[PDB]
Coordinates of C-alpha atoms (C1' of nucleotides) in Angstrom, one line a residue:
Chain A
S1 CA -2.1 -22.4 -6.3
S2 CA 0.6 -24.6 -4.3
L3 CA 0.2 -26.0 -0.7
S4 CA 3.3 -23.9 0.4
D5 CA 2.4 -20.9 0.0
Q6 CA -1.2 -21.6 0.8
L7 CA -0.2 -22.9 4.3
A8 CA 2.8 -19.8 4.5
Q9 CA -0.6 -17.9 4.5
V10 CA -1.6 -19.7 7.1
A11 CA 1.3 -18.1 9.0
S12 CA -0.3 -14.2 8.2
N13 CA -3.1 -15.3 9.4
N14 CA -1.8 -16.9 12.6
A15 CA 1.8 -15.0 12.9
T16 CA 0.5 -13.8 16.5
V17 CA -1.4 -16.0 18.1
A18 CA 1.6 -17.7 19.8
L19 CA 0.9 -21.9 20.1
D20 CA 4.8 -22.6 20.8
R21 CA 6.2 -21.8 23.2
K22 CA 8.9 -21.1 21.1
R23 CA 6.3 -18.9 19.3
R24 CA 5.4 -17.0 22.5
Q25 CA 9.6 -16.8 23.8
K26 CA 9.2 -15.8 19.7
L27 CA 6.0 -12.7 19.7
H28 CA 6.7 -11.7 23.3
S29 CA 10.9 -11.4 23.2
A30 CA 10.4 -8.0 20.2
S31 CA 9.7 -4.9 22.2
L32 CA 10.7 -1.2 21.3
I33 CA 13.4 -0.8 24.0
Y34 CA 14.1 -3.4 25.8
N35 CA 16.8 -6.6 24.2
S36 CA 14.4 -10.2 23.3
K37 CA 17.0 -11.8 26.1
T38 CA 15.6 -9.4 28.9
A39 CA 12.4 -8.5 26.6
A40 CA 11.9 -12.1 27.1
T41 CA 12.0 -12.3 31.1
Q42 CA 9.0 -10.0 31.5
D43 CA 5.2 -10.9 32.7
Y44 CA 2.5 -8.7 31.6
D45 CA 1.8 -6.7 35.0
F46 CA 5.5 -5.1 35.5
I47 CA 5.4 -4.1 31.3
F48 CA 1.4 -3.1 32.3
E49 CA 2.8 -1.2 35.0
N50 CA 5.8 0.7 33.1
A51 CA 3.0 1.8 30.2
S52 CA 0.8 2.7 32.9
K53 CA 4.1 4.8 34.4
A54 CA 4.7 6.4 31.2
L55 CA 1.0 6.9 30.3
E56 CA 0.4 9.4 33.4
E57 CA 2.5 11.6 32.5
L58 CA 1.6 11.5 29.5
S59 CA -2.0 12.3 30.4
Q60 CA -0.6 14.6 32.4
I61 CA 0.8 16.6 29.4
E62 CA -3.0 16.5 27.5
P63 CA -6.0 15.1 28.5
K64 CA -7.0 13.5 25.6
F65 CA -4.9 10.6 26.0
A66 CA -6.9 9.9 29.4
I67 CA -9.5 8.2 28.2
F68 CA -6.8 5.3 27.0
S69 CA -6.4 4.4 30.6
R70 CA -10.1 4.2 30.4
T71 CA -10.3 1.3 28.1
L72 CA -7.0 0.1 27.2
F73 CA -4.7 1.5 29.8
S74 CA -7.2 -0.7 31.8
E75 CA -6.2 -2.8 34.3
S76 CA -8.3 -5.2 33.4
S77 CA -6.8 -4.4 30.2
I78 CA -4.1 -7.0 30.4
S79 CA -5.4 -10.7 30.1
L80 CA -7.3 -9.7 26.6
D81 CA -5.7 -11.0 23.8
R82 CA -6.9 -9.9 20.4
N83 CA -7.5 -13.2 18.8
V84 CA -10.0 -14.5 21.6
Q85 CA -12.3 -12.0 20.5
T86 CA -14.3 -11.4 17.7
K87 CA -14.0 -9.5 14.3
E88 CA -16.4 -6.9 15.2
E89 CA -15.0 -6.6 18.9
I90 CA -11.6 -6.1 16.6
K91 CA -12.9 -3.2 14.6
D92 CA -13.0 -1.6 17.8
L93 CA -9.6 -2.2 19.1
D94 CA -8.4 -1.4 16.0
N95 CA -10.4 2.0 16.3
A96 CA -8.7 2.5 20.0
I97 CA -5.7 1.7 18.3
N98 CA -5.7 4.1 15.8
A99 CA -7.0 6.7 17.1
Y100 CA -4.2 6.3 19.8
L101 CA -1.7 6.2 17.4
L102 CA -1.8 9.6 15.6
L103 CA -2.7 10.8 19.1
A104 CA 0.7 9.6 19.9
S105 CA 2.6 10.8 16.9
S106 CA 3.1 14.2 18.6
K107 CA 4.5 13.6 21.4
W108 CA 6.8 10.5 19.6
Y109 CA 10.4 12.6 20.7
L110 CA 9.0 11.9 25.0
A111 CA 10.5 8.4 26.0
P112 CA 7.4 8.4 27.4
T113 CA 5.4 7.3 24.5
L114 CA 7.8 5.0 23.6
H115 CA 7.5 3.4 27.6
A116 CA 3.8 3.5 26.6
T117 CA 4.0 2.7 22.6
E118 CA 5.9 -0.4 24.0
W119 CA 3.6 -1.7 26.2
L120 CA 0.6 -1.5 22.9
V121 CA 2.9 -3.4 20.7
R122 CA 3.3 -6.1 23.6
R123 CA -0.5 -6.6 24.3
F124 CA -1.6 -6.4 21.0
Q125 CA 0.9 -6.9 18.5
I126 CA 0.3 -3.4 16.7
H127 CA 3.6 -4.1 15.2
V128 CA 1.5 -6.7 13.9
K129 CA -1.7 -6.9 13.9
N130 CA -2.1 -3.5 12.9
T131 CA 0.5 -2.1 11.6
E132 CA -0.8 -0.1 8.8
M133 CA -1.2 2.9 11.4
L134 CA 2.1 1.8 13.0
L135 CA 4.0 3.0 9.9
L136 CA 1.8 6.2 8.9
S137 CA 1.0 7.6 12.8
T138 CA 4.9 7.2 12.7
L139 CA 6.3 8.1 9.4
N140 CA 8.1 11.3 9.3
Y141 CA 10.5 10.1 12.5
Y142 CA 13.1 8.4 9.9
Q143 CA 16.5 9.4 11.5
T144 CA 14.9 9.0 14.8
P145 CA 16.7 5.4 16.6
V146 CA 13.6 4.9 18.0
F147 CA 12.1 4.4 14.5
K148 CA 15.0 2.5 13.7
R149 CA 14.1 0.4 16.4
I150 CA 10.6 0.2 15.4
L151 CA 10.9 -0.4 11.8
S152 CA 13.1 -4.0 12.5
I153 CA 10.3 -5.2 15.0
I154 CA 7.5 -4.2 12.5
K155 CA 5.8 -6.9 9.8
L156 CA 6.1 -5.1 7.2
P157 CA 3.3 -4.5 4.5
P158 CA 3.5 -4.5 1.5
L159 CA 3.1 -0.6 1.1
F160 CA 5.9 0.6 2.8
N161 CA 8.2 -1.6 0.8
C162 CA 11.0 0.2 0.1
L163 CA 12.1 -0.3 4.1
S164 CA 12.5 -4.3 3.8
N165 CA 16.2 -3.8 3.3
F166 CA 16.2 -1.4 6.4
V167 CA 14.4 -3.5 9.2
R168 CA 17.3 -4.6 11.6
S169 CA 19.6 -2.5 9.8
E170 CA 22.3 0.2 11.3
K171 CA 22.5 3.6 9.4
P172 CA 18.4 4.9 9.6
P173 CA 17.0 5.3 6.2
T174 CA 17.8 8.0 3.6
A175 CA 15.5 10.8 2.8
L176 CA 15.1 9.7 -0.9
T177 CA 13.2 6.2 0.7
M178 CA 11.1 8.9 1.5
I179 CA 10.1 9.9 -2.0
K180 CA 10.5 6.0 -3.2
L181 CA 7.9 5.1 -0.6
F182 CA 5.8 8.3 -1.5
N183 CA 6.6 8.0 -5.2
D184 CA 3.4 4.5 -4.9
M185 CA 0.2 5.6 -6.0
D186 CA -1.4 3.2 -3.4
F187 CA 0.9 4.5 -0.6
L188 CA -0.5 7.9 -1.3
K189 CA -4.3 6.8 -1.2
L190 CA -3.1 5.7 2.1
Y191 CA -1.5 8.8 3.3
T192 CA -5.0 10.7 2.0
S193 CA -6.7 8.1 4.4
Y194 CA -4.0 8.8 7.1
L195 CA -4.0 12.5 7.0
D196 CA -8.0 13.0 6.2
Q197 CA -8.6 10.6 9.0
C198 CA -6.5 13.6 11.4
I199 CA -8.3 16.1 9.9
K200 CA -11.6 15.1 11.0
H201 CA -9.8 13.9 14.4
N202 CA -7.6 17.5 14.3
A203 CA -4.4 15.6 15.6
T204 CA -2.4 17.3 13.6
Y205 CA 0.5 18.7 14.5
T206 CA 3.9 20.6 12.5
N207 CA 6.6 18.8 12.4
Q208 CA 4.5 15.4 10.6
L209 CA 2.8 18.1 8.4
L210 CA 5.7 19.9 7.1
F211 CA 7.0 16.1 6.3
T212 CA 3.5 15.6 4.8
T213 CA 4.5 18.3 2.6
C214 CA 8.0 17.8 1.5
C215 CA 6.9 14.1 0.5
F216 CA 3.8 15.5 -1.7
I217 CA 6.6 17.9 -3.3
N218 CA 8.9 15.5 -3.6
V219 CA 6.5 13.3 -5.7
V220 CA 4.9 15.7 -7.9
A221 CA 8.8 17.0 -8.5
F222 CA 9.6 13.3 -9.0
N223 CA 6.9 13.1 -11.8
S224 CA 8.3 16.4 -13.8
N225 CA 8.1 14.1 -16.9
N226 CA 5.2 11.4 -16.3
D227 CA 2.7 13.6 -17.5
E228 CA 0.5 10.4 -17.2
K229 CA 1.2 9.7 -14.2
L230 CA 1.1 13.2 -12.8
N231 CA -2.8 12.9 -14.8
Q232 CA -3.6 9.8 -12.0
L233 CA -1.7 12.7 -9.3
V234 CA -3.5 15.0 -9.4
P235 CA -6.6 13.6 -7.4
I236 CA -4.5 11.9 -5.0
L237 CA -2.9 15.3 -3.8
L238 CA -5.8 18.0 -4.9
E239 CA -8.2 15.8 -2.8
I240 CA -5.6 16.3 0.4
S241 CA -5.1 20.1 -0.2
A242 CA -9.7 20.4 -0.5
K243 CA -9.6 18.7 2.5
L244 CA -6.7 19.9 4.3
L245 CA -8.4 23.4 4.3
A246 CA -11.3 22.5 5.9
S247 CA -9.2 22.3 8.9
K248 CA -9.0 24.9 11.2
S249 CA -6.0 24.4 11.7
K250 CA -3.0 27.3 10.7
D251 CA 0.0 25.1 9.1
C252 CA -2.3 23.0 7.5
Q253 CA -3.5 25.4 5.6
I254 CA -0.2 26.6 4.2
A255 CA 0.4 23.0 3.4
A256 CA -2.4 22.7 1.5
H257 CA -0.9 26.0 0.3
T258 CA 2.6 24.4 -1.0
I259 CA 0.7 21.4 -2.1
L260 CA -1.3 24.5 -4.7
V261 CA 2.0 26.0 -5.2
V262 CA 4.2 23.2 -6.5
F263 CA 1.4 21.1 -8.1
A264 CA 0.7 24.1 -10.2
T265 CA 3.9 25.1 -10.6
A266 CA 4.5 21.5 -12.1
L267 CA 1.8 20.8 -14.1
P268 CA -0.4 23.2 -15.9
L269 CA -3.9 22.5 -14.5
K270 CA -6.9 24.3 -16.4
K271 CA -8.2 27.5 -15.4
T272 CA -11.7 26.8 -13.9
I273 CA -9.3 24.0 -11.4
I274 CA -7.3 26.9 -10.1
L275 CA -10.5 28.8 -9.8
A276 CA -12.2 25.9 -7.4
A277 CA -8.1 25.9 -5.5
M278 CA -8.9 29.4 -5.1
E279 CA -12.8 29.5 -3.9
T280 CA -11.3 26.7 -1.2
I281 CA -8.2 28.8 -0.6
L282 CA -9.6 32.0 -0.3
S283 CA -13.3 31.0 1.8
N284 CA -11.0 29.4 4.8
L285 CA -8.5 32.2 5.1
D286 CA -9.3 33.5 8.1
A287 CA -6.2 33.3 10.2
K288 CA -3.5 35.9 9.8
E289 CA -0.4 33.7 9.3
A290 CA -1.7 31.7 6.4
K291 CA -3.0 35.3 4.6
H292 CA 0.8 36.1 3.7
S293 CA 1.7 32.6 2.7
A294 CA -2.0 32.5 0.4
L295 CA -1.5 35.2 -1.5
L296 CA 1.5 34.1 -3.0
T297 CA 0.0 31.0 -3.1
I298 CA -2.5 33.1 -6.2
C299 CA 0.6 35.0 -7.2
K300 CA 1.9 31.3 -8.1
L301 CA -1.9 30.3 -9.4
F302 CA -2.7 33.0 -11.9
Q303 CA 0.8 32.3 -13.3
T304 CA 1.4 28.9 -13.7
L305 CA -1.4 29.2 -16.3
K306 CA -1.7 30.4 -20.3
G307 CA -4.4 29.7 -22.8
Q308 CA -8.1 31.8 -23.9
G309 CA -8.7 33.8 -21.4
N310 CA -5.5 33.6 -19.5
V311 CA -6.0 36.9 -17.7
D312 CA -10.3 37.0 -17.5
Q313 CA -11.9 38.5 -15.1
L314 CA -13.1 36.7 -11.5
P315 CA -16.4 35.0 -11.2
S316 CA -18.4 37.8 -9.1
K317 CA -18.2 35.1 -6.2
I318 CA -14.2 34.7 -6.1
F319 CA -14.2 38.5 -6.7
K320 CA -16.4 39.7 -3.3
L321 CA -14.9 36.8 -1.5
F322 CA -10.9 37.5 -2.4
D323 CA -12.4 41.6 -2.0
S324 CA -14.0 40.1 1.6
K325 CA -10.7 38.0 2.2
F326 CA -8.0 41.0 1.2
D327 CA -8.6 44.8 1.1
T328 CA -7.2 46.6 -1.6
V329 CA -5.0 48.1 1.1
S330 CA -3.6 44.6 1.6
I331 CA -2.8 44.5 -2.6
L332 CA -1.5 48.2 -2.3
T333 CA 0.5 47.2 0.7
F334 CA 2.2 44.1 -0.7
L335 CA 2.7 45.2 -4.5
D336 CA 5.3 47.6 -2.4
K337 CA 7.0 45.2 -1.1
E338 CA 11.2 44.7 -1.6
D339 CA 10.7 41.1 -2.1
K340 CA 7.8 41.9 -4.9
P341 CA 7.1 38.6 -6.3
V342 CA 6.0 38.3 -9.6
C343 CA 1.9 38.4 -9.5
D344 CA 1.7 39.7 -12.7
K345 CA -1.0 37.1 -14.7
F346 CA -3.2 37.9 -11.5
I347 CA -3.1 41.3 -11.0
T348 CA -4.3 42.8 -15.1
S349 CA -6.6 39.7 -14.5
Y350 CA -8.4 41.0 -11.8
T351 CA -8.0 44.8 -12.0
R352 CA -10.9 43.9 -14.4
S353 CA -13.1 42.2 -11.8
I354 CA -13.3 45.3 -10.2
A355 CA -14.0 47.1 -13.6
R356 CA -17.3 45.0 -13.8
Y357 CA -19.0 44.3 -10.5
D358 CA -16.5 46.8 -8.6
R359 CA -16.0 50.3 -10.7
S360 CA -15.8 52.4 -7.1
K361 CA -11.8 52.6 -6.7
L362 CA -10.2 52.7 -10.0
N363 CA -8.2 55.6 -8.3
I364 CA -7.1 52.1 -6.4
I365 CA -6.9 51.1 -10.2
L366 CA -4.3 54.1 -10.7
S367 CA -1.8 53.3 -7.6
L368 CA -2.1 49.4 -9.0
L369 CA -1.0 49.7 -12.3
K370 CA 1.8 52.3 -11.1
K371 CA 2.9 49.3 -9.0
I372 CA 4.1 47.0 -11.1
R373 CA 5.4 46.9 -14.4
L374 CA 2.9 44.2 -16.7
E375 CA 2.9 42.4 -19.5
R376 CA 2.6 43.8 -22.6
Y377 CA -0.7 41.8 -23.7
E378 CA -2.3 42.6 -20.4
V379 CA -2.1 46.6 -19.8
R380 CA -3.7 46.5 -23.7
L381 CA -6.0 43.9 -22.4
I382 CA -7.1 46.6 -19.9
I383 CA -6.8 49.3 -21.2
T384 CA -9.8 47.9 -24.0
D385 CA -11.6 47.4 -20.6
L386 CA -11.3 50.8 -19.4
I387 CA -12.7 51.5 -22.9
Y388 CA -16.0 50.2 -22.3
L389 CA -16.0 51.8 -19.0
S390 CA -15.2 55.3 -20.9
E391 CA -17.8 53.9 -23.0
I392 CA -20.8 52.3 -21.1
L393 CA -19.8 53.5 -17.5
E394 CA -20.9 57.4 -17.4
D395 CA -17.4 59.6 -17.3
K396 CA -15.2 60.7 -14.3
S397 CA -12.1 62.3 -13.1
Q398 CA -10.8 59.0 -12.6
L399 CA -10.9 57.2 -15.9
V400 CA -9.6 61.1 -17.1
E401 CA -6.6 60.3 -15.1
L402 CA -6.2 56.4 -15.7
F403 CA -6.2 57.7 -19.1
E404 CA -3.6 59.8 -18.6
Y405 CA -1.1 58.0 -16.7
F406 CA -2.1 55.8 -20.3
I407 CA -0.8 58.5 -22.5
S408 CA 2.0 59.1 -20.7
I409 CA 3.2 55.8 -20.6
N410 CA 2.5 53.9 -23.6
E411 CA 0.6 56.2 -25.6
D412 CA 0.5 54.5 -29.0
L413 CA -0.4 51.7 -27.4
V414 CA -3.6 53.2 -26.2
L415 CA -3.6 55.0 -30.2
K416 CA -3.4 51.3 -31.6
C417 CA -6.2 49.1 -29.7
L418 CA -8.3 52.9 -30.3
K419 CA -7.7 51.7 -33.9
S420 CA -8.8 49.2 -33.1
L421 CA -12.4 49.8 -31.4
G422 CA -13.4 53.1 -31.4
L423 CA -11.5 55.9 -32.8
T424 CA -8.7 58.7 -31.8
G425 CA -10.1 62.0 -31.4
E426 CA -14.0 60.7 -30.0
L427 CA -11.9 59.6 -27.2
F428 CA -10.6 62.9 -27.0
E429 CA -14.8 63.6 -27.2
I430 CA -14.9 61.0 -24.3
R431 CA -13.2 64.1 -21.9
Chain B
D1 CA -27.3 9.2 4.8
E2 CA -25.6 10.5 1.6
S3 CA -27.5 13.5 0.0
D4 CA -27.2 16.5 -2.6
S5 CA -31.1 17.8 -2.6
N6 CA -19.9 32.8 1.2
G7 CA -17.2 30.5 0.0
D8 CA -18.4 27.0 0.1
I9 CA -15.2 24.2 0.7
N10 CA -16.5 21.8 -1.0
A11 CA -15.3 24.0 -3.8
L12 CA -12.3 22.3 -5.1
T13 CA -14.2 18.6 -4.5
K14 CA -16.2 19.0 -7.0
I15 CA -14.6 20.6 -10.0
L16 CA -11.8 17.9 -9.2
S17 CA -14.5 15.1 -9.5
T18 CA -16.6 17.1 -12.8
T19 CA -12.7 16.6 -14.6
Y20 CA -10.5 13.3 -16.0
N21 CA -8.0 15.2 -17.8
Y22 CA -6.5 18.5 -15.7
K23 CA -4.5 19.4 -18.2
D24 CA -5.7 22.0 -20.7
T25 CA -5.8 20.2 -23.7
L26 CA -9.1 21.9 -25.0
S27 CA -7.0 25.7 -24.7
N28 CA -5.3 25.4 -27.2
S29 CA -3.0 28.0 -25.5
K30 CA -0.7 29.3 -28.1
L31 CA 2.4 28.8 -26.8
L32 CA 4.8 26.1 -25.9
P33 CA 4.3 23.8 -23.2
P34 CA 8.1 23.0 -22.2
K35 CA 10.3 19.7 -21.5
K36 CA 7.6 17.9 -24.6
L37 CA 7.8 18.4 -28.2
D38 CA 4.2 17.3 -29.9
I39 CA 6.3 16.5 -32.8
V40 CA 5.7 14.3 -35.9
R41 CA 8.2 12.7 -38.4
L42 CA 6.7 13.1 -41.7
Chain C
rC1 C1' 50.7 -11.7 -39.5
rA2 C1' 45.9 -14.3 -39.0
rU3 C1' 43.5 -12.7 -34.8
rU4 C1' 38.4 -15.5 -37.9
rG5 C1' 40.2 -12.1 -30.0
rG6 C1' 37.0 -8.9 -26.8
rU7 C1' 37.4 -4.8 -23.9
rG8 C1' 38.3 -0.1 -25.5
rA9 C1' 38.1 4.0 -28.3
rG10 C1' 35.0 5.6 -32.3
rC11 C1' 33.3 6.5 -37.0
rA12 C1' 30.7 5.1 -42.2
rG13 C1' 26.0 2.9 -41.5
rC14 C1' 20.7 1.8 -39.9
rG15 C1' 17.9 4.6 -37.6
rA16 C1' 9.7 8.4 -37.0
rA17 C1' 7.4 11.6 -30.2
rG18 C1' 14.2 6.1 -27.3
rG19 C1' 17.2 1.4 -28.3
rA20 C1' 19.7 -3.4 -25.6
rU21 C1' 18.1 -6.7 -22.1
rU22 C1' 16.8 -9.9 -17.2
rU23 C1' 12.2 -11.4 -14.6
rG24 C1' 8.2 -11.4 -11.2
rG25 C1' 2.5 -12.1 -11.1
rU26 C1' -2.2 -13.1 -13.9
rG27 C1' -4.5 -14.9 -18.3
rG28 C1' -5.1 -17.6 -23.3
rA29 C1' -4.5 -21.8 -25.9
rU30 C1' -1.8 -26.7 -25.1
rU31 C1' -7.7 -33.4 -27.1
rA32 C1' -13.7 -30.9 -30.5
rC33 C1' -17.8 -26.0 -27.1
rU34 C1' -24.0 -29.2 -24.6
rA35 C1' -24.1 -24.4 -18.0
rG36 C1' -24.3 -24.6 -11.5
rC37 C1' -25.9 -27.5 -7.6
rU38 C1' -29.0 -31.4 -5.3
rA39 C1' -32.3 -36.5 -2.5
rA40 C1' -32.5 -35.3 -9.7
rU41 C1' -38.7 -37.2 -14.8
rA42 C1' -38.2 -32.9 -10.0
rG43 C1' -37.4 -29.0 -7.1
rC44 C1' -33.0 -25.5 -6.2
rA45 C1' -29.6 -21.2 -7.5
rA46 C1' -32.0 -16.1 -1.2
rU47 C1' -33.2 -23.1 1.2
rC48 C1' -34.5 -27.1 2.0
rU49 C1' -36.3 -27.3 6.9
rA50 C1' -41.9 -27.3 11.0
rU51 C1' -44.7 -34.0 4.1
rU52 C1' -38.2 -36.5 4.0
rU53 C1' -40.8 -38.9 7.7
rC54 C1' -44.3 -43.9 6.6
rA55 C1' -44.5 -47.5 3.1
rA56 C1' -43.0 -50.9 0.3
rA57 C1' -37.9 -53.4 -1.8
rG58 C1' -34.4 -55.3 0.6
rA59 C1' -30.2 -60.7 4.4
rA60 C1' -26.3 -68.6 -0.1
rU61 C1' -20.7 -71.2 -1.3
rU62 C1' -25.3 -73.3 4.8
rC63 C1' -17.9 -70.3 7.4
rA64 C1' -16.1 -69.6 -1.6
rA65 C1' -13.5 -65.7 0.1
rA66 C1' -3.9 -63.9 1.0
rC67 C1' -5.3 -65.1 -7.4
rU68 C1' -0.4 -60.3 -4.3
rU69 C1' 5.2 -64.5 0.4
rG70 C1' 13.3 -62.1 -2.2
rG71 C1' 15.7 -67.7 -2.0
rG72 C1' 18.0 -71.2 1.2
rG73 C1' 18.0 -73.8 5.6
rG74 C1' 14.9 -74.6 9.9
rA75 C1' 10.3 -73.8 11.8
rA76 C1' 11.6 -74.9 19.1
rU77 C1' 7.0 -71.5 20.5
rG78 C1' 2.3 -70.6 17.6
rC79 C1' -1.2 -72.0 13.6
rC80 C1' -3.3 -75.2 10.3
rU81 C1' -4.4 -80.9 8.8
rU82 C1' -5.6 -85.4 10.5
rG83 C1' -4.0 -89.3 14.0
rU84 C1' -5.4 -89.9 18.5
rU85 C1' -8.2 -88.1 24.3
rG86 C1' -11.6 -85.6 28.0
rA87 C1' -16.0 -82.9 28.8
rA88 C1' -20.7 -80.3 28.0
rU89 C1' -25.1 -80.7 24.8
rA90 C1' -25.7 -84.5 16.0
rU91 C1' -21.7 -80.1 16.9
rU92 C1' -17.9 -76.9 19.7
rC93 C1' -14.0 -76.7 23.8
rU94 C1' -9.9 -79.8 27.1
rU95 C1' -5.9 -82.8 26.2
rC96 C1' -1.4 -85.0 22.9
rA97 C1' 1.2 -86.5 18.5
rA98 C1' 2.1 -87.1 13.2
rG99 C1' 3.5 -83.1 9.6
rU100 C1' 11.7 -82.5 3.4
rG101 C1' 3.6 -78.8 7.8
rU102 C1' 3.9 -73.0 7.8
rA103 C1' 3.3 -65.8 4.2
rA104 C1' 4.0 -65.9 12.6
rC105 C1' 8.2 -66.9 14.7
rC106 C1' 15.4 -67.6 13.6
rU107 C1' 19.6 -67.2 11.4
rC108 C1' 23.0 -67.2 6.0
rC109 C1' 22.6 -65.0 1.2
rU110 C1' 20.2 -61.0 -1.2
rC111 C1' 27.6 -55.1 0.2
rU112 C1' 32.7 -54.9 -1.5
rC113 C1' 33.3 -52.4 -8.5
rA114 C1' 38.7 -54.1 -15.2
rA115 C1' 35.0 -47.2 -10.0
rA116 C1' 39.7 -44.0 -7.8
rU117 C1' 43.9 -44.0 -4.2
rC118 C1' 48.4 -46.2 -2.4
rA119 C1' 53.0 -48.8 -1.3
rG120 C1' 56.4 -53.0 -5.4

RNA sequence: CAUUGGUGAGCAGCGAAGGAUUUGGUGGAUUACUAGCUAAUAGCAAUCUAUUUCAAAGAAUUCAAACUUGGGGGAAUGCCUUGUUGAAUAUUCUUCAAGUGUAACCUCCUCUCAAAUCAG
């Protein structure tokens, strides 16, 4: 290397350790509300008293911020600077700071949060010392001028490099910069490391989470052509979707649902991956408000695919999980909706899974098959398995009404597959 | 610590992990994908 | 009219799932390749530390020692040299002069040009 770059690297090693007093009046004078002439003349104790003055109201809003009064907002936690500590102590400092950041990420519209984190900016240089968590916890607030102030103060990491033109700017950072920020690959590995961190800690609130799905979804919007870049984009999004569905949270569930919907509708995965998606979706479909979304997810999911075995029957674990988390009459209500969304490739696949494992509710299938105008090969492919359940399952009046409906609608289709399999008069010899 | 020895929630992750190409290129789907023509000048 | 000027439209023409440009970073060569480190015949390379230390070997210009200084002056005050004086015990030191003596120390030079502008 050069000497000058090898020495400007030591600026990055000691960007916060103020040695000359002008370095102090640079390093203390930037904070989240106060102008740098009044921010220059602030004693540490005076800022900590305002810190507790916002922190007590925050802890009274929810008690989880009370523990940072024990450690971070302690009255003993003023004089200690970071650079005086060992890195093993600095790691625990960063742990406290990070867990505080995703916590306060919800409460950030409050001026209590702005007055609380400004001291942490000023006591622990978290605009510089830990700026990846500062930005990742507070990324969704890109319209708010509190964040826009925060942009003029953060030493920008290479991972957040779209905003290199937006630090110390007037107008707020635009919506397209969020996509171009997220359109990088390793940025998405940071956003997994944020959201997965929020999942185990269960600090996942709705507005930021809607911003997550709107950014990830717009990423696959931007990668509609770059199918090889999309094929390295499946590992980052489907991991976030899977680890999202392990949440108790229902907004996180519909978030992972939107991820799977827009991902399958933008890029056709293999069928077995969609079966994995169905297992992870249905295996945590518990609360009510996610069911209406999650049904439409599989409605999209089975429509996103095409191949050999396009509408084949589901596995018995998958089908019994589906018929545990939904009833029959759930889908019997849903297909009679006036929205009536096109789950055409799902029904003709799921009725076969009824027709092999269960076989007990084919009056239900009659109700099902009168509801939806299906596809041409689909009805034929249902009728072949119903020929199979004519032959091997003992013939019953439910199947008689089934095939009488199938003579009422597309008798000749039945005649063609019967000329393919079996005979015509032998099907009259069925019942 | 990490050892292998109703539906499970690891079910997406495992089937991702045993895949590298997630596009079903082994399909021969007999439908045409949009926007990208496998076309060769002869 | 030549435009032999480009813009600008275009077209013939070239033409395989783009073409054209501009740049960041890094690697490879830019002499003809025998491995890294150390206390080195050996040990290391996860280590030389509670054998690294004893031992031997190891001391002249009797004080040769600016090969190095822009050039002139001088060189007061310093130094050098001998001349010369005292003291101590054959030698240092006190005292003193003579030196077109002197890389200390004082000044003069080592700037003013058919370069240009400008009145006449």
